[PDB]
Amino acid sequence: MNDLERLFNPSAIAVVGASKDPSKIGSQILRNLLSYGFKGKVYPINPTADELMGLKCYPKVSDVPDKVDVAVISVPSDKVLGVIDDCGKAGVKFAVVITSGFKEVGNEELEEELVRRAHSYGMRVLGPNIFGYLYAPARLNATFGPKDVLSGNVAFISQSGALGIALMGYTVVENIGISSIVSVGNKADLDDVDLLDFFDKDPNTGVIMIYLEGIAPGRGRMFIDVASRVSLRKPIIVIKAGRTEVGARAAASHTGSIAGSVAIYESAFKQSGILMAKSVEDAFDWTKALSWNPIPEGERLIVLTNGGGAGVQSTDTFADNGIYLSKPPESLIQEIKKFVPPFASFANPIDITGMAPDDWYYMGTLAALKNPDVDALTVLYCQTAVTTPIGVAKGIVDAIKEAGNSKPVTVGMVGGPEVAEAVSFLNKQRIAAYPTPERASSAMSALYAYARARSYVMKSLAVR
Amino acid sequence: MNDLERLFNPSAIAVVGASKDPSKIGSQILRNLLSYGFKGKVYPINPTADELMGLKCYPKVSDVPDKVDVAVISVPSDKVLGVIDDCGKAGVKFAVVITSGFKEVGNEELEEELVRRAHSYGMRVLGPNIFGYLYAPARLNATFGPKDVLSGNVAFISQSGALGIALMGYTVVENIGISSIVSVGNKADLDDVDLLDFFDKDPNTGVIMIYLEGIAPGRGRMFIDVASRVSLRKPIIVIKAGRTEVGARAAASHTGSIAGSVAIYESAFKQSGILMAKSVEDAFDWTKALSWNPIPEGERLIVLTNGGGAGVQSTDTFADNGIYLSKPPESLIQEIKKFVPPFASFANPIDITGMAPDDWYYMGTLAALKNPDVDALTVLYCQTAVTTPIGVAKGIVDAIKEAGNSKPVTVGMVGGPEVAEAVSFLNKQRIAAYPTPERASSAMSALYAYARARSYVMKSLAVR
Amino acid sequence: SSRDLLLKAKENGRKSLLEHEAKYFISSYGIPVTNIRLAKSEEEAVNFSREIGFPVVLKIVSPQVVHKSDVGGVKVNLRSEEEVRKAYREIIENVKRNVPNAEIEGILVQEFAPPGVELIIGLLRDPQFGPTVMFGLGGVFVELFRDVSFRVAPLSEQDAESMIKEVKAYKLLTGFRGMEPVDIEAIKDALIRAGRIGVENEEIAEMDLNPVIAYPKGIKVVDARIILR
Amino acid sequence: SSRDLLLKAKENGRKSLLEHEAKYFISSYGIPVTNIRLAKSEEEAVNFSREIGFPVVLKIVSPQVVHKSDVGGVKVNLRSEEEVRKAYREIIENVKRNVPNAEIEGILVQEFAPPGVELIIGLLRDPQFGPTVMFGLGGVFVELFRDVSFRVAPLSEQDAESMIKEVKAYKLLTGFRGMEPVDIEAIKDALIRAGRIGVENEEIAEMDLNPVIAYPKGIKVVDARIILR
Ligand SMILES: Nc1ncnc2c1ncn2[C@@H]1O[C@H](COP(=O)(O)OP(=O)(O)O)[C@@H](O)[C@H]1O
Ligand SMILES: Nc1ncnc2c1ncn2[C@@H]1O[C@H](COP(=O)(O)OP(=O)(O)O)[C@@H](O)[C@H]1O
Ligand SMILES: [Mg+2]
Ligand SMILES: [Mg+2]
Ligand code: NA
Ligand code: NA
Numbered sequence A, B: 001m002n003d004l005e006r007l008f009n010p011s012a013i014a015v016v017g018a019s020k021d022p023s024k025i026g027s028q029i030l031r032n033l034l035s036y037g038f039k040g041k042v043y044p045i046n047p048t049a050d051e052l053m054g055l056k057c058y059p060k061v062s063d064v065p066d067k068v069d070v071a072v073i074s075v076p077s078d079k080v081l082g083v084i085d086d087c088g089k090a091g092v093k094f095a096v097v098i099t100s101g102f103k104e105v106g107n108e109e110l111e112e113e114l115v116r117r118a119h120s121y122g123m124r125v126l127g128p129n130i131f132g133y134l135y136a137p138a139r140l141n142a143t144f145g146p147k148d149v150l151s152g153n154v155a156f157i158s159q160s161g162a163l164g165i166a167l168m169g170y171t172v173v174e175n176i177g178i179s180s181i182v183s184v185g186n187k188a189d190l191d192d193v194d195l196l197d198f199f200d201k202d203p204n205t206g207v208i209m210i211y212l213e214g215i216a217p218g219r220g221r222m223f224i225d226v227a228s229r230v231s232l233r234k235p236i237i238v239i240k241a242g243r244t245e246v247g248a249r250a251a252a253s254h255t256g257s258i259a260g261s262v263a264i265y266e267s268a269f270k271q272s273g274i275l276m277a278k279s280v281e282d283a284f285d286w287t288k289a290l291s292w293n294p295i296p297e298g299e300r301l302i303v304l305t306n307g308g309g310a311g312v313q314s315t316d317t318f319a320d321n322g323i324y325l326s327k328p329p330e331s332l333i334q335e336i337k338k339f340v341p342p343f344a345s346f347a348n349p350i351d352i353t354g355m356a357p358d359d360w361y362y363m364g365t366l367a368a369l370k371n372p373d374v375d376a377l378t379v380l381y382c383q384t385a386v387t388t389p390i391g392v393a394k395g396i397v398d399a400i401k402e403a404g405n406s407k408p409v410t411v412g413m414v415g416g417p418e419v420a421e422a423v424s425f426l427n428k429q430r431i432a433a434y435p436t437p438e439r440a441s442s443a444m445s446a447l448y449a450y451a452r453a454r455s456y457v458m459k460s461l462a463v464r
Numbered sequence C, D: 001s002s003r004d005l006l007l008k009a010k011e012n013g014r015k016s017l018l019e020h021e022a023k024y025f026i027s028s029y030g031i032p033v034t035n036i037r038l039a040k041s042e043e044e045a046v047n048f049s050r051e052i053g054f055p056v057v058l059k060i061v062s063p064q065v066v067h068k069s070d071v072g073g074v075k076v077n078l079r080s081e082e083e084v085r086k087a088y089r090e091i092i093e094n095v096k097r098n099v100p101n102a103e104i105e106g107i108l109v110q111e112f113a114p115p116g117v118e119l120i121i122g123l124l125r126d127p128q129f130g131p132t133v134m135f136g137l138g139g140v141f142v143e144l145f146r147d148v149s150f151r152v153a154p155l156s157e158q159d160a161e162s163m164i165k166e167v168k169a170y171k172l173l174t175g176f177r178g179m180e181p182v183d184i185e186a187i188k189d190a191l192i193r194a195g196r197i198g199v200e201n202e203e204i205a206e207m208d209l210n211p212v213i214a215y216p217k218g219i220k221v222v223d224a225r226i227i228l229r
């Protein structure tokens, strides 16, 4: 009932609602399951079809000559209960109820009934009203969203359907590698706590991002207990929907609920070690940095820039996040004075001046990263005719390799189309790069915010 | 002395420091002047060259048989005073001193002497320590930055050289149409106040964006008087460097000065009707919206969305900017109920649900914009397989055309690479589009912020 | 057991504890309260006042009177027998006028707490997160500015310390013009204990320690309300 | 002209105005001040005290004593002729002992301001923006929390009104427990005048109206400091 191993790694999946019509939801899901490359058995379920997409079809899950782990259900809402009973008889462990038309439209009784019946068979429910789920390590795409994601270590959980399925697509554009996408929708049964327990134990998942509108009554304490322990090893980013009083009342009506307290949700996230993102862009920017970098081991952050202006944008942005730069170590200053002009600034940011050619980025970045008194590095670049963006980017890459260590690095590059390409090159190398200095600084800030959140939790778990 | 008409629209420009060596700054400037298409006379100035890039060259500006309006001076700092004397002898009105090595490196005496000498000839100085300037209506690119910008109505003034020249390139990537780029650098003579006076009167300029580190002692009152008056007709966005206590001390040392008061600068920008941006991204996002839209005539802002989640993100972001949505007009609701399913939400945001096809975006957008009780529209789109991003975008374009009016519109689209193209398509049509719902809402919020800032100024100028 | 107070109130159909019952209850959890005595006669009131020592405070004790100040039921800083007897009858009548037939349990005699920095410690039940502790500075800082912090119970020392530092009026605790720093450890301790009260006692819907007066050494709960469910 | 007060101070090499001179100066700009009289004898003091009305306040006036409280030079809430004569001689000695090398201009007789909501109105000169008006709530709100708003002078009504609404303690002006709303129009009016003082008088480096007491009708400046340059 509480172990989700067979949901994410099933041997057999039935798709209920697939048909000869390719426009049907069930049909789209079936298509994604096959194109993404699921290696287990897939059983299309359809009253009349003999075969769908080259697969033997059955009229009911109970007719399948096999143990079905998961049934993906997309039939009309007034047919769902029947399908649930059949799945129950057939011994199905997980009912992934795609179908909408439940509590979110006022039919609360139907939803409660759905869960009751599923539970009487020892079966758990995901949804209803969801777009499905994806698990990259099982080459399992049981959604009607995009057919593919970049492979990686980020798990994304979404209470929102349309925004969830769109963000599944946006991860590709933002170069975020995904281990899983889970649509939880109405959260009538399986919820965030259940999922965090699975992702805690999943070695494929290193970062968890959640779009969260609300938590069920009586579930919050357990949410804090689980999330806080997960946070000790894996960062959790929450995009809280309804994070203002106004928005909280708005989202209250969208799901048909009583409005949760903004202030208390915020304290719960603090006690859980969770980073709360106010926007998609912040959430994704932070998820990138957290996914591709270890947390800094101390507060010795260096900013390297070929322009004072970008450096001050960075300093102001770090400051907004409670991050204050201190004088670089003297050894680093000396190492850099070997090539830098007399009127470079070494206050931190280290300003290597606008005259800096590509190779100074290689040398500065390398010196910073090898220095034993440097914990983290943000590299800022402003495009000038003296440099090439791709050359600066390759210098940073080479430096990171030759330094050998893993210290957190973020990169901000400002300029034209050549910068856009250099930034894309870096992100495709899993070096967190952004097109403005403030975003690169906000991303680095997320690494420190997570280090501080983890410390909050460790302190709160101390034995007396 | 105070009229900049001949700086931006000169009949004759001399470039001092150009040579057969293409890597010299002067040569880069000369190359840009020719490629961007300046139609007046260009006079390369060089001691020995008989010709540069097909143009008769002279050893001194005073040898040019013409009235030179502007001399772009790129020679070593210890030669600048001499070139200034010669420009003075020749009756030159503006000295654009590219050359660095003045107050920014401690040579305050040289900088003050520069200005003193220029003033003794009735000449003004831009800079020193700048990358030049561009004025699109005069096809004048007197910078060593990118060779081209998109034409439009945005004037960009930058006190930072590296960030300024980088942002000059970034305007292309962000589809921002430019009327002018002015590098002001050390601001020894001509400053933001002088420039604001010119852009106030320029019919080609509709929006002014300023990267500002600081204003000179005794210059702030005049800055408010001028800016407040410009703000009545043209929005001014300032990216303030040193907007935190920490950053203010930092930038104090970067320019070699005492730290300006953060709080008092904020009050001065409020009294000026200025929008202060905390980041490059915000500044550019707002600039786009302000450049391509009139200000809303009232508070009847409609958010149209195919998903509750994007809508809630939007509601929260508007709420953070003090913008609260109210019920749509009944007429608009009835118009939309003609095609929308029964469980669509009309609270504002208007949720036309995730199953909405491309055409509902055309119909909804058209209905909203044509409604006499709607003042502004933010359209949100989450990519689903039911739609195409480009079809939604073309629907939005068509609705805007057919509505005929100009009500402010911003668009937020979330999804994969096809959304990235559709967003790009919209911005190339000068429809302010963004890849997240919060950025589209923050952009719309800037239109309202400007309306309120202008109202602050109007109220503060009220007659007793 | 102090739970007998809760059971007793539930048995009598009351939905809140009287002030003396509430203070006794939180005291048993180790939260410092005013020394108190329930007087049933004017003679009891004078006699207890001597025992406790001057100055004292007299408060009406009635299931009916939830807001005692706003009905003339609170007499503060009484330094003599005459001031006490005046207060006794005065409250009897101030309350007889605004609250007739009220079942008076009696009049509470308690020491007049010297001036300090006033605090509020609250306990509520959030539908999601259950028992939640609330902290803020007293007076206008909570009442008017809503400057409050929350932690979901049970509280660790880290939770209590950080929620104190979080409120915008925090510097009122670390010394300002005419006021020494107060005992932060004592505040932390009371916050953790308030959390424990909420976790352990299901029948307690809500608790409000207001004012709680903080001193350079120790704190004292001057008024306490406990609502039952 | 009130400028004679500034010119006199500069002529005698002084870099600030005495309390009575500062109140005269701002009063001439239409900013309400505590009614005052400069007494040169214990006898002048009783007569002025009756004119002004009881209760009164007596303060030592000397170029040397900048902090009158910190030398026993301030006597508040004097309600009788005798209390006045008592405060008079007592101040003469409180200061004669702690500062024997001190020039007395006299003793200021002053109206005792009843309690209200305290404010601060400041004027400073910013290097960029010149004369700038500062507003905040009195007491800990400016001193400890730094809750202040600024507007560059001259101030429009719009500037004055918005800068008042901007401060975090704004609600202390619109009515709270035990306090009626105060005269916002009078505050706006004083802020505007304060700005005018700064724009017009180049020799004034800094001005601090603190405390300023706001009432349901009108305000009163109780202490005023003006620094010269
Ligand atoms: N024992 C006490 N020591 C000091 N002050 C007290 C004491 N009891 C009450 N007060 C003061 O009197 C106020 C009113 O009393 P309180 O117990 O709060 O009754 P209520 O809130 O029902 O009117 C308190 O807020 C506090 O300022
Ligand atoms: N006329 C007055 N009416 C009411 N309170 C007064 C009066 N004069 C002084 N006070 C109070 O006494 C305090 C001390 O006097 P003040 O003028 O500030 O002198 P100083 O700061 O040099 O000691 C003031 O801050 C104010 O709170
Ligand atoms: Mg009370
Ligand atoms: Mg004082
Ligand atoms: Na520089
Ligand atoms: Na600079």
Ligand code: NA
Pocket (backbone or CB within 6 Å): B326, B327, B328, B329
């Ligand atoms: Na409305």
